Design a protein around this motif. Structure first.
Motif, PDB file in Angstrom:
ATOM      1  N   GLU A   1       0.809  -1.213   0.000  1.00 48.36           N
ATOM      2  CA  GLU A   1       0.000   0.000   0.000  1.00 48.36           C
ATOM      3  C   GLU A   1       0.845   1.267   0.000  1.00 48.36           C
ATOM      4  O   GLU A   1       0.323   2.343  -0.310  1.00 48.36           O
ATOM      5  CB  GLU A   1      -0.943   0.009   1.203  1.00 48.36           C
ATOM      6  N   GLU A   2       2.127   1.171   0.343  1.00 50.53           N
ATOM      7  CA  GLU A   2       3.011   2.326   0.304  1.00 50.53           C
ATOM      8  C   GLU A   2       3.501   2.549  -1.121  1.00 50.53           C
ATOM      9  O   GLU A   2       3.905   1.603  -1.801  1.00 50.53           O
ATOM     10  CB  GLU A   2       4.194   2.125   1.246  1.00 50.53           C
ATOM     11  N   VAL A   3       3.465   3.805  -1.570  1.00 58.16           N
ATOM     12  CA  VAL A   3       3.871   4.121  -2.936  1.00 58.16           C
ATOM     13  C   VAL A   3       5.379   3.976  -3.106  1.00 58.16           C
ATOM     14  O   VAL A   3       5.858   3.627  -4.194  1.00 58.16           O
ATOM     15  CB  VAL A   3       3.385   5.532  -3.313  1.00 58.16           C
ATOM     16  N   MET A   4       6.149   4.242  -2.049  1.00 59.10           N
ATOM     17  CA  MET A   4       7.596   4.068  -2.120  1.00 59.10           C
ATOM     18  C   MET A   4       7.961   2.629  -2.453  1.00 59.10           C
ATOM     19  O   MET A   4       8.849   2.378  -3.276  1.00 59.10           O
ATOM     20  CB  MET A   4       8.234   4.488  -0.797  1.00 59.10           C
ATOM     21  N   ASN A   5       7.284   1.670  -1.823  1.00 61.97           N
ATOM     22  CA  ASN A   5       7.568   0.266  -2.087  1.00 61.97           C
ATOM     23  C   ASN A   5       7.195  -0.113  -3.512  1.00 61.97           C
ATOM     24  O   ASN A   5       7.909  -0.885  -4.161  1.00 61.97           O
ATOM     25  CB  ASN A   5       6.828  -0.609  -1.080  1.00 61.97           C
ATOM     26  N   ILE A   6       6.084   0.421  -4.018  1.00 58.74           N
ATOM     27  CA  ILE A   6       5.688   0.148  -5.395  1.00 58.74           C
ATOM     28  C   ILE A   6       6.734   0.682  -6.364  1.00 58.74           C
ATOM     29  O   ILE A   6       7.120   0.001  -7.324  1.00 58.74           O
ATOM     30  CB  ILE A   6       4.297   0.745  -5.675  1.00 58.74           C
ATOM     31  N   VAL A   7       7.212   1.906  -6.126  1.00 57.79           N
ATOM     32  CA  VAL A   7       8.237   2.487  -6.989  1.00 57.79           C
ATOM     33  C   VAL A   7       9.520   1.668  -6.929  1.00 57.79           C
ATOM     34  O   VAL A   7      10.155   1.411  -7.958  1.00 57.79           O
ATOM     35  CB  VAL A   7       8.485   3.957  -6.612  1.00 57.79           C
ATOM     36  N   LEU A   8       9.928   1.254  -5.726  1.00 60.60           N
ATOM     37  CA  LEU A   8      11.139   0.452  -5.593  1.00 60.60           C
ATOM     38  C   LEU A   8      11.012  -0.871  -6.336  1.00 60.60           C
ATOM     39  O   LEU A   8      11.945  -1.290  -7.032  1.00 60.60           O
ATOM     40  CB  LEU A   8      11.450   0.205  -4.118  1.00 60.60           C
ATOM     41  N   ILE A   9       9.863  -1.539  -6.208  1.00 57.80           N
ATOM     42  CA  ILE A   9       9.652  -2.809  -6.898  1.00 57.80           C
ATOM     43  C   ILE A   9       9.689  -2.611  -8.407  1.00 57.80           C
ATOM     44  O   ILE A   9      10.300  -3.400  -9.138  1.00 57.80           O
ATOM     45  CB  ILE A   9       8.325  -3.447  -6.442  1.00 57.80           C
ATOM     46  N   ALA A  10       9.023  -1.564  -8.901  1.00 52.94           N
ATOM     47  CA  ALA A  10       9.001  -1.315 -10.338  1.00 52.94           C
ATOM     48  C   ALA A  10      10.395  -1.008 -10.865  1.00 52.94           C
ATOM     49  O   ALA A  10      10.779  -1.487 -11.937  1.00 52.94           O
ATOM     50  CB  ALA A  10       8.039  -0.174 -10.661  1.00 52.94           C
ATOM     51  N   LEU A  11      11.172  -0.219 -10.119  1.00 57.54           N
ATOM     52  CA  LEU A  11      12.531   0.094 -10.541  1.00 57.54           C
ATOM     53  C   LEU A  11      13.416  -1.144 -10.530  1.00 57.54           C
ATOM     54  O   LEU A  11      14.239  -1.326 -11.430  1.00 57.54           O
ATOM     55  CB  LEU A  11      13.123   1.183  -9.649  1.00 57.54           C
ATOM     56  N   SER A  12      13.262  -2.011  -9.525  1.00 55.10           N
ATOM     57  CA  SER A  12      14.036  -3.248  -9.499  1.00 55.10           C
ATOM     58  C   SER A  12      13.690  -4.139 -10.682  1.00 55.10           C
ATOM     59  O   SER A  12      14.580  -4.718 -11.317  1.00 55.10           O
ATOM     60  CB  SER A  12      13.799  -3.996  -8.190  1.00 55.10           C
ATOM     61  N   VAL A  13      12.400  -4.263 -10.995  1.00 55.40           N
ATOM     62  CA  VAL A  13      11.994  -5.095 -12.122  1.00 55.40           C
ATOM     63  C   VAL A  13      12.521  -4.516 -13.428  1.00 55.40           C
ATOM     64  O   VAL A  13      13.005  -5.251 -14.298  1.00 55.40           O
ATOM     65  CB  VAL A  13      10.463  -5.263 -12.138  1.00 55.40           C
ATOM     66  N   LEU A  14      12.447  -3.191 -13.583  1.00 54.79           N
ATOM     67  CA  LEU A  14      12.970  -2.551 -14.785  1.00 54.79           C
ATOM     68  C   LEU A  14      14.476  -2.739 -14.907  1.00 54.79           C
ATOM     69  O   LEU A  14      14.989  -2.987 -16.003  1.00 54.79           O
ATOM     70  CB  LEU A  14      12.615  -1.066 -14.785  1.00 54.79           C
ATOM     71  N   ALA A  15      15.204  -2.616 -13.795  1.00 58.68           N
ATOM     72  CA  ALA A  15      16.646  -2.817 -13.826  1.00 58.68           C
ATOM     73  C   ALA A  15      16.990  -4.245 -14.216  1.00 58.68           C
ATOM     74  O   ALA A  15      17.896  -4.473 -15.024  1.00 58.68           O
ATOM     75  CB  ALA A  15      17.256  -2.466 -12.470  1.00 58.68           C
ATOM     76  N   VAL A  16      16.268  -5.221 -13.660  1.00 57.77           N
ATOM     77  CA  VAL A  16      16.517  -6.617 -14.006  1.00 57.77           C
ATOM     78  C   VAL A  16      16.227  -6.860 -15.481  1.00 57.77           C
ATOM     79  O   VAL A  16      16.988  -7.549 -16.170  1.00 57.77           O
ATOM     80  CB  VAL A  16      15.698  -7.552 -13.101  1.00 57.77           C
ATOM     81  N   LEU A  17      15.132  -6.292 -15.993  1.00 57.69           N
ATOM     82  CA  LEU A  17      14.802  -6.477 -17.404  1.00 57.69           C
ATOM     83  C   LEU A  17      15.866  -5.862 -18.302  1.00 57.69           C
ATOM     84  O   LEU A  17      16.284  -6.477 -19.291  1.00 57.69           O
ATOM     85  CB  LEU A  17      13.429  -5.882 -17.706  1.00 57.69           C
ATOM     86  N   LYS A  18      16.309  -4.641 -17.985  1.00 53.19           N
ATOM     87  CA  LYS A  18      17.319  -3.989 -18.811  1.00 53.19           C
ATOM     88  C   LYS A  18      18.621  -4.774 -18.771  1.00 53.19           C
ATOM     89  O   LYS A  18      19.290  -4.942 -19.798  1.00 53.19           O
ATOM     90  CB  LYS A  18      17.543  -2.545 -18.362  1.00 53.19           C
ATOM     91  N   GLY A  19      19.013  -5.231 -17.579  1.00 54.24           N
ATOM     92  CA  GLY A  19      20.218  -6.028 -17.461  1.00 54.24           C
ATOM     93  C   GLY A  19      20.143  -7.295 -18.286  1.00 54.24           C
ATOM     94  O   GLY A  19      21.104  -7.661 -18.959  1.00 54.24           O
ATOM     95  N   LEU A  20      19.018  -8.011 -18.198  1.00 49.69           N
ATOM     96  CA  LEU A  20      18.854  -9.234 -18.980  1.00 49.69           C
ATOM     97  C   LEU A  20      18.931  -8.949 -20.475  1.00 49.69           C
ATOM     98  O   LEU A  20      19.573  -9.695 -21.223  1.00 49.69           O
ATOM     99  CB  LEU A  20      17.530  -9.910 -18.632  1.00 49.69           C
ATOM    100  N   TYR A  21      18.278  -7.874 -20.927  1.00 49.22           N
ATOM    101  CA  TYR A  21      18.360  -7.483 -22.332  1.00 49.22           C
ATOM    102  C   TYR A  21      19.814  -7.275 -22.739  1.00 49.22           C
ATOM    103  O   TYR A  21      20.286  -7.835 -23.740  1.00 49.22           O
ATOM    104  CB  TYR A  21      17.529  -6.219 -22.565  1.00 49.22           C
ATOM    105  N   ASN A  22      20.530  -6.441 -21.983  1.00 52.71           N
ATOM    106  CA  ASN A  22      21.925  -6.157 -22.301  1.00 52.71           C
ATOM    107  C   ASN A  22      22.739  -7.442 -22.318  1.00 52.71           C
ATOM    108  O   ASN A  22      23.530  -7.676 -23.235  1.00 52.71           O
ATOM    109  CB  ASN A  22      22.503  -5.160 -21.301  1.00 52.71           C
ATOM    110  N   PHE A  23      22.578  -8.277 -21.289  1.00 48.53           N
ATOM    111  CA  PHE A  23      23.367  -9.496 -21.182  1.00 48.53           C
ATOM    112  C   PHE A  23      23.119 -10.411 -22.369  1.00 48.53           C
ATOM    113  O   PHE A  23      24.051 -11.045 -22.877  1.00 48.53           O
ATOM    114  CB  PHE A  23      23.040 -10.220 -19.878  1.00 48.53           C
ATOM    115  N   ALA A  24      21.873 -10.498 -22.831  1.00 50.62           N
ATOM    116  CA  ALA A  24      21.555 -11.417 -23.910  1.00 50.62           C
ATOM    117  C   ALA A  24      21.598 -10.752 -25.278  1.00 50.62           C
ATOM    118  O   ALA A  24      21.130 -11.345 -26.254  1.00 50.62           O
ATOM    119  CB  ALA A  24      20.180 -12.045 -23.680  1.00 50.62           C
ATOM    120  N   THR A  25      22.142  -9.539 -25.372  1.00 55.63           N
ATOM    121  CA  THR A  25      22.321  -8.949 -26.697  1.00 55.63           C
ATOM    122  C   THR A  25      23.765  -8.511 -26.933  1.00 55.63           C
ATOM    123  O   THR A  25      24.219  -8.470 -28.081  1.00 55.63           O
ATOM    124  CB  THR A  25      21.396  -7.747 -26.908  1.00 55.63           C
ATOM    125  N   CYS A  26      24.493  -8.177 -25.864  1.00 50.50           N
ATOM    126  CA  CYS A  26      25.856  -7.671 -26.008  1.00 50.50           C
ATOM    127  C   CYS A  26      26.793  -8.723 -26.592  1.00 50.50           C
ATOM    128  O   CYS A  26      27.637  -8.409 -27.439  1.00 50.50           O
ATOM    129  CB  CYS A  26      26.381  -7.164 -24.663  1.00 50.50           C
TER     130      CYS A  26
END
Lengths: 53, 48, 48, 53, 48, 53
Positions: A15-40
């Motif tokens: 219910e806290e917006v800070m936690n939602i933002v943190l979760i979304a940023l972590s998921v986005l970071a993991v997705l970007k990292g996976l993209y980079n790792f599997a394309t570089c």
């Protein structure tokens, strides 16, 4: 570490917006990292060395 | 001067009560993972 | 609602007794240094 | 400031895995940054400047 | 054994008394914004 | 959240060098981000979008 403790008590803190933002940023970071790792080329290197084998 | 520190620490205490440390750890590790990814992008590792 | 906050604060206080704050400072500063280098490698500064 | 405190607590905190991960990440970051700074053209800029005067 | 945890926690408490939590939130959010920007730069979004 | 609190506390804790470094790092990050968000090609894409309609 305590990431499992976070997973156990997810409903009681979502219910806290800070936690939602943190979760979304972590998921986005993991997705970007996976993209980079599997394309570089890292995975390509692993496949190249196995192909040599 | 104790009032200032008590107020700033009360802010920290409330944040710690509302945000689990596991989420902070997950965010830090995801950021580090993504940074390592962009490093391996900048080094142009070839298959050759 | 005090059980949730007490549990979260307990895990924070356990972390603060194991990880030194100087190490957190060093990690933050090193990541900032790496980010600055990343920006300088993206801006593409030539000798001109 | 408090960094030296960490540099005097090393024998007492090196056994925690989180501390090992943090130290390794910091060293890796510093090294990657120095690698970038070495091969970013900044050094070339410096040399060009010295060449001019 | 509790001396070590107490001194590490005392360092954390002093930092919380001197550095506001809004400042560290601002730092974290600014670094995340910069990270998103560098991802956009690396992925080479098209215009066409 | 409490960023407004940080703005209300500017005169009180501006003397700490750690806070000065944190503020400088945040402002620098935001500026580098805006530079990227304006040079990456996001603007180019949205202008092409407007060009179409």
């Amino acid at each position: 570490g305590q990431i499992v403790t976070f997973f156990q008590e997810v409903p009681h803190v979502i219910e806290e917006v800070m936690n939602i933002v943190l979760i979304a940023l972590s998921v986005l970071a993991v997705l970007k990292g996976l993209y980079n790792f599997a394309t570089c080329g890292l995975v390509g290197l692993v496949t190249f060395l196995l192909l040599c084998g | 001067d104790n009032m200032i520190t008590e107020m700033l620490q009360k802010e920290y205490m409330e944040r710690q009560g509302k945000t689990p440390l596991g989420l902070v750890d997950l965010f830090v590790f995801s950021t580090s993972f993504y940074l390592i990814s962009i490093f391996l992008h900048l080094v142009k590792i070839p298959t050759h």
